[PDB]
From a paper:
The type 1 insulin-like growth factor receptor ([name]) is a class II receptor tyrosine kinase (RTK), belonging to the insulin receptor family, that plays critical roles in cell growth and differentiation. [name] and insulin receptor (IR) are closely related, and share 57% sequence identity and high structural similarity. Each [name] and IR protomer consists of the L1, CR, L2, FnIII-1,−2,−3, transmembrane (TM), and kinase domains. Two such protomers are linked by multiple disulfide bonds, forming a stable, covalent dimer.
In this study, we determine the cryo-EM structure of the full-length [name]–[name] complex in the active state at an overall resolution of 4.3 Å. We successfully reconstituted the complex of full-length mouse [name] (MmIGF1R) and human [name] (HsIGF1) in vitro for cryo-EM analysis. Our structure reveals a Γ-shaped asymmetric [name] dimer bound to only one [name] molecule. The [name]-binding site is formed by the L1 and CR domains (CRD) of one [name] protomer, and the α-CT′ and FnIII-1′ domains of the other. The distance between the two membrane-proximal FnIII-3 domains in the [name]-bound [name] is ~39 Å, which is much shorter than that in the apo [name] dimer (~65 Å). In our structure of the [name]–[name] complex, the C-domain loop of [name] inserts into a groove formed by L1 and CRDs of [name]. The aromatic side chain of Y31 of [name] is sandwiched between P5 in the L1 domain and P256 in the CRD, and is further surrounded by several other conserved hydrophobic residues in the CRD, including F241, F251, and I255. In the asymmetric active dimer of [name] with only one [name] bound, the two α-CT motifs from both protomers converge at the FnIII-1′ domain and form a rigid helical beam. The L1′–FnIII-2′ intra-protomer interaction in the membrane-proximal region further stabilizes the active dimer.
Author numbering:
A (entry chain D): 1 to 153, 162 to 189, 193 to 260, 265 to 294, 301 to 510, 515 to 526, 532 to 558, 562 to 645, ...
B (entry chain B): 4 to 37, 41 to 63
C (entry chain A): 1 to 35, 41 to 158, 162 to 189, 192 to 210, 212 to 256, 263 to 302, 306 to 625, 671 to 706, ...
């Protein structure tokens, strides 16, 4: 059952009863301003399934979700939108989710849901499968994501990056249809005259809500002759439109549609007022008519004469231009001024195609007629040798519009015959289209050059149309690692300009990072009628001469074993030339002879060798910080100016990694390791400077054992000289010898240096008491203790 | 002067129960004579007197 | 023999022989990056610093400088006097004769083998020791040097309360000349104190480095009035410097200085004399234009306050320009011709020019133009101020195509420059100059604030634009500001990051929650300056946009407790007396009042930046909601038709303390009170120990040592225990023998107390004798009377 032409639910919960009856809502559906002061009784309305035009929800206190109220809503074609939209919900408390599972296909508009944080389950449901212009939707301001975290009770398809739970509530899920196609309840593309779903597949009548027209239970893509196309969803008889209560103050059959009014010169035929035969809109009150949205514009469709004004401004969206053409094109003549401001999707005014005659009668201030301002992405005026245009009166103006070409205005002032009207201000030239120009004379580079830090560019000397124009030059440039770079207009590497004035005109760029592919191009600045040309030039690339590299970093190392050394480092912060390899040198380190020179057996302590928010920076700190940095700078400035030719050293040539293992080394020895980076241009340049490191090889642990049997001998007054060989390869360096011995337990402890050991070949405790005795030795190497050697016996009798 | 949401609630605070007036459309002429509110109460200030003009009878 | 002016040495060991001849270096001394056997005994004294950097293959220093004695440090190196850096294979600081480092402080870092360090005092060779820098050497557990004596030393001393000898290298010793008088020589003779280092005693002609000046072989504290001082050490006659190689070294205050300092200028009449004047050195600077684009191209203008010509300012961009740009040019007084600034964008306000007072324009520009500014995208503020007696007397001014400068500012110009009736009427084209600035505003106010010593809460009024909806997102600025001559254009030069830290608050979720803010991370007792500006978003323009900013407000945190004083060190001029030296604190946190000193004997054994690319992006949204809103209302509604003691260190960083006991430890604590501790509480703690080292009078026993004819042959040496030894006896040493004491008795008190004397049993009959030097807490100094335990038959 159908209903028209609109419903206005307001202030009266009871009033909702007006939806008791039908399911085809011709016109619109307003639901606004319903206080929850009345308790909610779940007024179900199932029959309804489709509405032609927009659906509006505004401030209905007391509603929790939508399915409760609307179970069967499937499709909304949206003939006459509501501010470029089809369904809009605004300022809704109490509202938890949108139980609109049954919806599958929405045709024209977009969805705007805003300022309702009382709700979630938004980032789930995909719309792209419903409508097309997803980029015209608008959903923010509802509850932040990190407080929602909702989970479905269904299918999972990537939501622009990844799939998750697409379910219109905690009790339903998002339907879909496999790649079969129309669609049915269970996976089948029905009669291709369908929309939404069909009861049973492939029928002219069983389709739940069939698209593309409607007629007497049938679905056709073209109404029969006696019928007519009505409201873009049905077909009608002559009698029905003959009995329509217009209340515009019977529709006119034309082109087989029941249209109410008629284009110009098409008048109700004499006694056939039901038909228009061939033989202008706006009001005198407002005198102006802004245009922002299709509703603001579709309410203008069908006019050719216009009185008033044309204020135009559009903030965002997809190719609205398509629609604005599809309507405004019929316009030809306007009385008052035309003005444009802040428009951003007006790529080009081409949609006002059939405008030819402008009056400019009621002019703006300064008696202005054609007025543009600040509109960013407008790049081309429709003025081309097809559309002539004769501005009667008034004056023009342009400002800030950065994408048009500064000569398009010239063709315009040509065609409109006002080239002798406006001043340099009235049509600015400093700041219009400057961010992209059309075309001009070309220039040629005479010759380039390159040192390691400086460059002198020479272009070919230009000559102007009239020589008394001082033709100066500018030179734009920057670093470029790539070619995905424009040329058109610091800080985060944007650009840097320089100015310049009988020799060939050249210029000198200086103090440049070595080996950086700078991009350069000259631009012609005039110094003077619109007879200016200027001259762009070519995007030239230049890589500066190579230079000596910078020392490495990250210099760390250790020993996974004896005579093996692992060292990792950092590539240079300034390679300055394609990398070639690194060099590694090393040296043995002479042990500290003082250990030799000063016996430490008698010493009371022995040495050991380990092996292998944003709190804003205040002022006073920052001062000393910068000073420290300056200090290190003036310090390494010296070492920066040195060349370097590529116990002896032993070299290496590592190129691939920044870490290496070394072999062929004595065990547990102190080593030091010089490192250099080395570019591929040091054949005559010279290889990099040096940064060192220290390291100590691994024990060897296992050689502090006395290399034989520990042997004794007696002497006169009981001086037992002991014979034990020195462990030839001590762990680093051998200091002394732990000597335990005694009658029953070797409780008594003895210390034996390396002088006496070299003085006698052992040690000798003199005047010992007799009895049965045995002895042991432990060594004292550099790594630590030795090993408590075998008990050997000796019995000086009593 | 009042604009914004500060408007809507205020109107309830002047209407309360009586609701708002709507000029119901019946025969759906493809046309409508539609000066509003923020033209009035958001560019100048308006009194609590004329607000009745919008409240239902 | 003089030797100047400096010495640069690099990459050529042989270049070292550039020193073969001279004896005193009149300048700096660099040594860098050398790839044997060399000695230079001529060198004695330096006047500038000394730098050693990465010269591998060097054994010590003194082997290259065996007679560096004193370094007068007359021209430092980044506030330093001696700097070593990265000297592989340098085992030990060979310099064993450096005596009175005048000014700087040592800087030694990252050297593999620079041990023999803690075994060298600094307190007797320079005076500001605690400003040194020592890191990255051999960690102090890995070399453990020795000192000349393995059998017996030179002297040992205290510092930081410990003992050790004082030796540079294993074959040299540091030499303290004792307190005999105080300048010295070898063998401890008191030289004529007017010299320094060494003396070849009471000589005025036979020493190495005359302190305090030098003249004609004679030490002197002031050279005669014909002899003018020079380089801080030596004087010369009048004609000398004149005949020495822009003129020479002008005479001033008995000096032949290279440049006579600030506060003077040369009397061309005898141009070698410069007279003090009143002005700040009026210096002048062919052509009449002088372009500027970046920081450097101004370099040739630093200081000359008078320029003969014009200025053409064209800066595209750079770093935080204004600061150093001004510091280069900010001194200009009066420029002759015109002034013009074109196409230059990175400028925000021209205040960097400080002292433009008179601009005369004797070279006008086309059509008699003196003041020309043109197409500068980011200029907002002219230094034309409430604080300029600026004066112009020629040419018309000109202004074109500068949006960020409203006409009301430039309007006050001619009424403060006296150039009203001179300019034409189309010059100030109010069409463009000053369109998109915001110079008319509504003014915010404040309500209240609270100030914790390190936190601030401030709250201001509630703003209400003509329309409610227009976003309000307040943005607040502050900066550390020790003064009041400050207004909001210092670093806001398209960088903005110099002199206004900024944070953002957001609109309160409360309908009537008054919007204030807390700020943290502060500095106590440091006047901040804050203010707050109301970020509208939209064309609230009736004619031009409104905008709204507070007015600047100063604040300062409540005071708080001071911190620890620095560098508690101390020396004993005598035993039983101690003198302290310490460093004033770091964060006074308020006016300092005085210090607290005590002593006590001791016992025995969420980042908040705004991503601007989002910022303006957020504007449109709330803006976009605005217009969409109004369509709703415009279409819905329809009208009906152990004691311790305390003192008050009040003014000085040095105080003695008296009447102690010698060689007795003392925990020393300095506390420091601000003027706020009386209700808050005083400093934290800083401790140090300092034994008043003795005094050998009471090391040996001054009581009579009596032997005893004992039972089975033995000698009981009953000397009474001294009542007050020099502290106490560790162990007794009694050298005994027949008549020349042949062996020595070792008696600890553990071996003495239980006895109270000394017994030697089983003696070979025959007369004997002995003597005692009790190793006491002052050490084995004075010897006892040589006791006679003669035991003949």
């Amino acid at each position: 059952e159908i209903c028209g032409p609109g419903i206005d639910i307001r202030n009266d919960y009871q009033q909702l009863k007006r939806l008791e009856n039908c399911t085809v809502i011709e016109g619109f559906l307003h639901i606004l301003l319903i206080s929850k002061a009345e308790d909610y009784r779940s007024y179900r309305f199932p029959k309804l399934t489709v509405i032609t035009e927009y659906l509006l929800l505004f401030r209905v206190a007391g509603l929790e979700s939508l399915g409760d109220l609307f179970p069967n809503l499937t499709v909304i074609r949206g003939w006459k939108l509501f501010y470029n939209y089809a369904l809009v919900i605004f300022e809704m408390t109490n509202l938890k989710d949108i139980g609109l599972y049954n919806l599958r296909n929405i045709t024209r508009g977009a969805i705007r849901i805003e300022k309702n944080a009382d709700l979630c389950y938004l980032s789930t449901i995909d719309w792209s499968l419903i409508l097309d212009a997803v980029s015209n939707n608008y959903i923010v301001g509802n509850k932040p994501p990190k407080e929602c975290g909702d989970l479905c009770p269904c299918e999972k398809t990537t939501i622009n990056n990844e799939y998750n739970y697409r379910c219109w509530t905690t009790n339903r899920c998002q339907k879909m249809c496999p790649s079969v196609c129309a669609c049915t309840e269970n996976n089948e593309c029905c009669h291709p005259e369908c929309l939404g779903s069909c009861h049973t597949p492939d029928d002219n009548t069983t389709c739940v809500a069939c698209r593309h027209y409607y007629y007497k239970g049938v679905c056709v893509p073209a109404c029969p002759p006696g019928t007519y196309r009505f409201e873009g969803w049905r077909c009608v008889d002559r009698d029905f439109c003959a009995n329509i209560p217009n209340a515009e103050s019977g529709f006119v059959i034309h082109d087989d549609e029941c249209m109410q009014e008629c284009p110009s010169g098409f008048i109700r035929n004499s006694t056939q007022s039901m038909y228009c035969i061939p033989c202008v809109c706006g009001d005198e009150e407002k005198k102006t008519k802004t245009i922002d949205s299709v509703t603001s514009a579709q309410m203008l469709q069908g006019c050719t004469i216009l009185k008033g004004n044309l204020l135009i401004n559009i903030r965002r969206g997809n190719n609205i231009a398509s629609e604005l053409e599809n309507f405004m094109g019929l316009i030809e003549v306007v009385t008052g001024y035309v003005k444009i401001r802040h428009s951003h999707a007006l790529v080009s005014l081409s949609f006002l195609k059939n405008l030819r005659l402008i009056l400019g009668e009621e002019q703006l201030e300064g008696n202005y007629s054609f007025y543009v301002l600040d509109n960013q992405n407008l790049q081309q005026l429709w003025d081309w040798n097809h559309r002539n245009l004769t501005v009667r009166s008034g004056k023009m103006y342009f400002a800030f519009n950065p994408k048009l070409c500064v000569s398009e205005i010239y063709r315009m002032e040509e065609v409109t015959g006002t080239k002798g009207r406006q001043s340099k201000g009235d049509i600015n030239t400093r700041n219009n289209g400057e961010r992209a120009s059309c075309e001009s004379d070309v220039l040629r580079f005479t010759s380039t050059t390159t040192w390691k830090n400086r460059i002198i560019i020479t272009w070919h000397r230009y000559r102007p149309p009239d020589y008394r124009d001082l033709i100066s030059f500018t030179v734009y440039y920057k670093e470029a690692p790539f070619k995905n770079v424009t040329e058109y207009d610091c800080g985060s590497n944007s650009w840097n300009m320089v100015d310049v004035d009988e020799g060939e005109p050249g210029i000198l760029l200086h103090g440049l990072k070595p080996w950086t592919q700078y991009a350069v191009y000259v631009k012609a600045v005039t110094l003077t009628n619109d007879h200016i040309r200027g001259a762009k030039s070519e995007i030239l690339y230049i890589r500066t001469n190579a230079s000596v590299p910078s020392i490495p970093l990250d210099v760390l190392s250790a020993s996974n074993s004896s005579s093996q050394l692992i060292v990792k480092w950092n590539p240079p912060t300034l390679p300055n030339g394609n990398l070639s390899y690194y060099i590694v040198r090393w040296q043995r380190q002479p042990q500290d002879g003082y250990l030799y020179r000063h016996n430490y057996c008698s010493k009371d302590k022995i040495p050991i060798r380990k092996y292998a928010c944003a709190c804003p920076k205040t002022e006073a700190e920052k001062q000393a910080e910068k000073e420290e940095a300056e200090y290190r700078k003036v310090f390494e400035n010296f070492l920066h100016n040195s060349i370097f030719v590529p116990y002896p050293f032993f070299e290496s040539r590592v190129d691939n990694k920044e870490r290496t293992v070394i072999s062929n080394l004595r065990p547990f020895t102190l080593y030091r390791i010089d490192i250099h980076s080395c570019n591929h241009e040091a054949e005559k340049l010279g290889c990099s400077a040096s940064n060192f490191v220290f390291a100590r090889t691994m024990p060897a642990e296992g050689a502090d054992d006395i290399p034989g049997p520990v042997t004794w001998e007696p002497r006169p007054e009981n001086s037992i000289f002991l014979k034990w060989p020195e462990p030839e390869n001590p762990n680093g360096l051998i200091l002394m010898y732990e000597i335990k011995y005694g009658s029953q337990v070797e409780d008594q402890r003895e210390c034996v240096s390396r002088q006496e050991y070299r003085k006698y070949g052992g040690a000798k405790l003199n005047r010992l008491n007799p009895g049965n005795y045995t002895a042991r030795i432990q060594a004292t190497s550099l790594s630590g203790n030795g090993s408590w050697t075998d008990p050997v016996f000796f019995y000086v009798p009593a | 002067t009042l604009c914004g949401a500060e408007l809507v609630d205020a109107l309830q605070f002047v209407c309360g129960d009586r609701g708002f007036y709507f000029n119901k459309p019946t025969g759906y002429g493809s046309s409508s004579r539609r000066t509003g509110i923020v033209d009035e109460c958001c560019f100048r200030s308006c009194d609590l007197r004329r607000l009745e003009m919008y409240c239902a009878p």
